[PDB]
Automatic annotation (TrEMBL), chain B:
The lineage of its organism: Eukaryota, Metazoa, Chordata, Craniata, Vertebrata. The chain holds residues 21 to 310 of 349 of the full protein. As a major transporter of conjugated bile salts from plasma into the hepatocyte, it plays a key role in the enterohepatic circulation of bile salts necessary for the solubilization and absorption of dietary fat and fat-soluble vitamins. It is strictly dependent on the extracellular presence of sodium. It exhibits broad substrate specificity and transports various bile acids, such as taurocholate, cholate, as well as non-bile acid organic compounds, such as estrone sulfate. It comes from Macaca fascicularis (Crab-eating macaque). It catalyses: cholate(out) + 2 Na(+)(out) = cholate(in) + 2 Na(+)(in); taurodeoxycholate(out) + 2 Na(+)(out) = taurodeoxycholate(in) + 2 Na(+)(in); taurohyodeoxycholate(out) + 2 Na(+)(out) = taurohyodeoxycholate(in) + 2 Na(+)(in); glycocholate(out) + 2 Na(+)(out) = glycocholate(in) + 2 Na(+)(in). GO terms for molecular function: bile acid:sodium symporter activity. It is found in: Cell membrane. This is Hepatic sodium/bile acid cotransporter.
Length: 224, 290, 213
């Protein structure tokens, strides 16, 4: 088996520098070139550079020659990258790829990493604030009931939002977050039977591994 | 890849034995005489390093080739004179006492000029530099399986000119056997070469480069009014090339998937070079018969 | 550098019909290779050298063409093929990927289930109020949302948040929040969320009145 391990995410400040690691195991490290690909959400993939671990020779992209510096260390089999002087438009996902190619018996196969979601923060970490939502009392009672748990004002991504610690898997809808004043808000929805809502407590647990904050809040009807 | 290693070993033995056979046709005194007063050698070096790489450059520009394909053509052009010329020049009674000088001095000058020509020509085709990927431990190592068999051949002739026979027949027999072996080892890869969609522009380039080399060498020799045998010797030294460096340069500089079909380019260059050389040999021998 | 004009950017398809994606290079390219990226996953090599297949790709896929116009053909589309396809060339540096096409799955049109949730008292205690509008299980994805306060449209503080394809129902969803201060929320009593879709000419109107709480 061939496996390429990359960090889940990296947090930086604008104008700073970051190092991306791509630890490869299960195959001899000094034969296949290591290609770095950057993916900005909202555009296509962009090719950054290559590096031959056994020789050190590199070929860069035209616009990344002054921002990227690929390096390898054959002792640790770890291929590195060093992004320098980051900007607000450098927030993307960076993949490390090796491609198997030969002509004796023609066949090819890719081995991609999981991607290191690099973002520019410029704002201190803030933990999630769950704002519970309840169906309107004047609304007609139905067999299925809409529920929501709005989370607003926290940083940075990612955030895990489930219902009853993953007990429910049908109708679980979670929406992508949007940035607002250097902070992002997320929402989630789920469909449950009318009887199960009061009988069984539904808690919209929120996990924020970046801030190591875990807040669990249940859903209750609006009583006044 | 074991087939590649076996091919390299059999080809090294092929060169060893064929040059052991070939070293019987020259004498050290003539080598010294031709090396001194460098008239033919200067013309051969000027040809191989000013008109073959320039032909590569112009032809790649005019055939509308890629950056990598143009790089491959340039690397084949800048390569030193191959050891095929030594065998070929015997087929038209060329001055063998000078082809060895050409090959040796061409290899030695390539060892220090190939990076220079590559840097002067690949501007605008390659972002980095090629003065670091050229194998300098292979240019000077390919010269040994040429000088050693030739030297032992001349020593055998000069000291003991009675073992002329027997060894010649044995060498020819083993050469035929190993040539059949190489044919078997190469017919299994020619199929994959033709399965790969090599662009017909590259096939035209590989077929047309040695022809231009031969004709420009003949014209250059005619301009300076060389001898009879020396004319053919230069006109066929300037056309034969050592394309076993192109594969190494391309593999080191570029990933295995960028080169793609170009991995089979040296085989195509060898087969077209052999075809054109044999055609010229047959034409010249027919001319000599009449 | 070679740029790619890959069209169409968004494609609708059905499970069983042939579909074609055309990558139109802006310069002569020998070989064109196609990458498939599923939902939330790293792209993997799909078709290389414009006709060959990578390891593991089903045999239904096929590429054709030469010059500056390459196509990817699917003989019989299945539900597993909904992903994004990028055309990539490495024959002339620098390697440039295409804009990418988003291949979806079509189905019968469905009406959104518009919902309204009153702002929680925690937001009011904090000093603000944000009402939400939930649209769930609708198709096709194009939809316009109108936010009206006291019967008057207010474009200020309007949020939109789509979703990806539902792997079970092949539909979409929406999320709209109106961000206002606590005083602004207390200034009015009637809040209306208007949803307009191609399925029904009459927009779906959901309203909440704070007078009755
Ligand atoms: C492989 C040889 C060329 C190699 C070269 O010039 N440099 C490589 C040396 S190294 O690895 O880099 O050390 C070529 C040059 C001359 C060739 C020969 C000629 O082309 C033709 C004859 C024909 C005979 O009937 C048998 C084969 C042969 C005798 C060929 C064998 C082989 O192809 C040779 C010997
Ligand atoms: C092209 C062959 C080797 C040259 C070389 O450098 N190959 C590298 C292969 S790869 O890139 O690494 O795959 C040469 C070497 C020996 C040659 C052969 C021999 O010289 C003789 C045989 C026998 C036939 O009767 C005549 C053609 C032939 C069948 C030749 C064909 C071709 O020119 C061969 C096979």
């Amino acid at each position: 088996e061939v496996q390429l391990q990359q960090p889940g995410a990296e947090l930086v400040k604008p104008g700073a520098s970051v190092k991306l690691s791509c630890k490869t195991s299960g195959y001899t490290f000094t034969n296949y070139w290591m290609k770095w690909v950057k993916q900005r959400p909202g555009q296509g993939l962009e090719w950054i550079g290559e590096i031959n671990p056994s020789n050190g020779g590199t070929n860069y992209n035209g616009k990344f020659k002054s921002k990227a510096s690929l390096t390898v260390d054959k002792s640790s089999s770890t291929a590195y990258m060093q992004l320098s002087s980051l900007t607000s438009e450098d927030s993307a996902v960076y993949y490390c790829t090796i491609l198997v190619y030969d002509a004796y018996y023609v066949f090819a196969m890719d081995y991609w990493g999981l991607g290191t979601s690099v973002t520019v923060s410029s704002a201190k970490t803030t933990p999630p604030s769950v704002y519970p939502l309840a169906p309107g009392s004047a609304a007609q009672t139905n067999s299925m009931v809409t529920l929501g748990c709005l989370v607003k004002g926290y940083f940075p991504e990612p955030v895990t939002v489930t219902w009853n610690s993953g007990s429910l898997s049908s109708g679980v809808h979670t929406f992508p977050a949007v940035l607002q004043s250097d902070l992002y808000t997320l929402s989630s929805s789920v469909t449950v039977p009318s009887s199960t809502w009061p009988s069984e407590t539904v808690t919209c647990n929120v996990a924020h591994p970046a801030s190591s904050t875990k807040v669990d809040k249940k859903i209750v009807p609006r009583d006044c | 890849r074991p087939t590649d290693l076996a091919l390299s070993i059999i080809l090294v033995f092929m060169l060893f034995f064929v040059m052991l056979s070939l070293g019987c046709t020259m004498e050290f005194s003539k080598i010294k005489a031709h090396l001194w007063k460098p008239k033919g050698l200067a013309i051969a070096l000027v040809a191989q390093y000013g008109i073959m790489p320039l032909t590569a450059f112009v032809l790649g520009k005019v055939f509308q080739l890629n950056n990598i394909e143009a790089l491959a053509i340039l690397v084949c052009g800048c390569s030193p004179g191959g050891n095929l010329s030594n065998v070929f020049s015997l087929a038209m009674k060329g001055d063998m006492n000078l082809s060895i000088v050409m090959t040796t001095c061409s290899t030695f000058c390539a060892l220090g000029m190939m990076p220079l020509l590559l840097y002067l020509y690949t501007r605008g085709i390659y972002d980095g530099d090629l003065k670091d990927k050229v194998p300098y431990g292979r240019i000077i190592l390919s010269l040994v399986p040429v000088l050693i068999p030739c030297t032992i051949g001349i020593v055998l002739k000069s000291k003991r000119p009675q073992y002329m026979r027997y060894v010649i027949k044995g060498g020819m027999i083993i050469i035929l056997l190993c040539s059949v072996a190489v044919t078997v080892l190469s017919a299994i890869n020619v199929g994959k070469s033709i399965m790969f969609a090599m662009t017909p522009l590259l096939i035209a380039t590989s077929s047309l480069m040695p022809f231009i080399g031969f004709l420009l060498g003949y014209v250059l020799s005619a301009l300076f009014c060389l001898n009879g045998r020396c004319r053919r010797t230069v006109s066929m030294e300037t056309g034969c090339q050592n394309v076993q460096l192109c594969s190494t340069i391309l593999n080191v500089a570029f990933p295995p998937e960028v080169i793609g079909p170009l991995f089979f380019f040296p085989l195509l260059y060898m087969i077209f070079q052999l075809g054109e050389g044999l055609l010229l040999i047959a034409m010249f021998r027919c001319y000599e018969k009449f | 550098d070679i740029v790619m004009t890959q069209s169409p950017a968004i494609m609708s398809a059905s499970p069983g019909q042939k579909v074609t994606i055309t990558c139109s290079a802006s310069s002569s390219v020998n070989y064109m290779h196609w990458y498939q990226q599923k939902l939330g996953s790293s792209p993997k090599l799909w078709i290389y050298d414009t006709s060959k297949l990578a390891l593991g790709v089903p045999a239904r896929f096929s590429g054709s063409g030469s010059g500056t116009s390459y196509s990817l053909t699917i003989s019989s589309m299945e539900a597993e093929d909904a992903a994004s396809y990028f055309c990539h060339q490495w024959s002339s540096y620098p390697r440039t990927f295409g804009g990418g096409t988003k291949l979806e799955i079509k189905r019968a049109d469905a009406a959104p289930t518009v919902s309204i949730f009153p702002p929680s008292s925690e937001q009011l205690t904090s000093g603000g109020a944000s009402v939400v509008c939930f649209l769930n299980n609708f198709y096709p994805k194009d939809i316009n949302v109108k936010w009206k306060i006291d019967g008057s449209e207010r474009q200020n503080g309007v949020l939109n948040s789509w979703t990806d394809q539902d792997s079970k129902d092949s539909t979409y969803s929406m999320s709209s929040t109106l961000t206002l201060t606590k005083d602004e929320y207390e200034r009015h009593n009637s809040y209306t969320c208007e949803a307009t879709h191609k399925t029904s000419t009459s927009p779906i109107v959901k309203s909440f009145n704070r007078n009755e709480c």
